Design a protein around this ligand. Structure first.
Ligand SMILES: [Ca+2]
Length: 249
């Protein structure tokens, strides 16, 4: 009939239903398995179900395709929650947005993506939020140091990329970094990609147990903020109260 474009959304609300929407890469025969779980403590046992890394010291390669789109002349928002319930030592917690040309059964560390975004932890020296744009054959990393969350709780990560070559990074629905694409990377069409068609979780973990949930790819900042409050905002207080109840035990 005669609104925000929701290019991709995943909340894992239909039990085993997610297996049809996500594809495991067969590039290697030893990739780790994601399992559906809400972990040992949660805000809501059912709502907080997400994809959890289940095997230590493994590479992960799982991806979801969606009807392809271009962000040309549009704002692009990529958002998701990451919960390092295990008290992570070293491991990725970022997503990669690929063009539709990706063969999902062959996705691996070298697969050509458009944008990579999210937290990476590797001991005390790396607690950072990556913001990477693939530009003219190179993966260009942000020149700002954005500290990521390293506790056991669910955190919302949001990247906003605007058609005026500006961006914003939010953690828990609050701005943590912003600036211009020309200023914050060493590169007017910089922001735009002809095609996005796959969101991938392509990463390494030593201590596994991270849970990913509430993925959203949209062209509207205000909608991503509302969805953020409907997901992460609903989890927050009750999840903390449950862990506090358990810590005392
Ligand atoms: Ca969920």
């Amino acid at each position: 009939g005669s609104e925000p474009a929701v290019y991709f959304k995943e909340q894992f609300l239909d039990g085993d239903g997610w297996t049809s929407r996500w594809i495991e890469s067969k590039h290697k025969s030893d990739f780790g398995k994601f399992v559906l779980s809400s972990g040992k403590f949660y805000g809501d046992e059912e709502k907080d179900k997400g994809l959890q890394t289940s095997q230590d010291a493994r590479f992960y390669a799982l991806s979801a395709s969606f009807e392809p789109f271009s962000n040309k002349g549009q704002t692009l928002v990529v958002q998701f929650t990451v919960k390092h319930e295990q008290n992570i030592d070293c491991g990725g917690g970022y997503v990669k947005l690929f063009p539709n040309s990706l063969d999902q059964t062959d996705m691996h560390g070298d697969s050509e993506y458009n944008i990579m975004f999210g937290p990476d932890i590797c001991g005390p020296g790396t607690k950072k939020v990556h913001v990477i744009f693939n530009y003219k054959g190179k993966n260009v990393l942000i020149n700002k140091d954005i500290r990521c969350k390293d506790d056991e709780f669910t955190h919302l990560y949001t990247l906003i990329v605007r058609p005026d070559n500006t961006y914003e990074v939010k953690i828990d629905n609050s701005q943590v970094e912003s600036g211009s694409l020309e200023d914050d990377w060493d590169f007017p069409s910089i922001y735009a990609y002809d095609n996005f068609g796959v969101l991938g979780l392509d990463l390494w973990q030593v201590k596994s147990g991270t849970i990913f949930d509430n993925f959203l790819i949209t062209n509207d900042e205000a909608y991503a903020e509302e969805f953020g409050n409907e997901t992460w905002g609903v989890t927050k207080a009750a999840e903390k109260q449950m862990k506090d109840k358990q810590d005392e035990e």
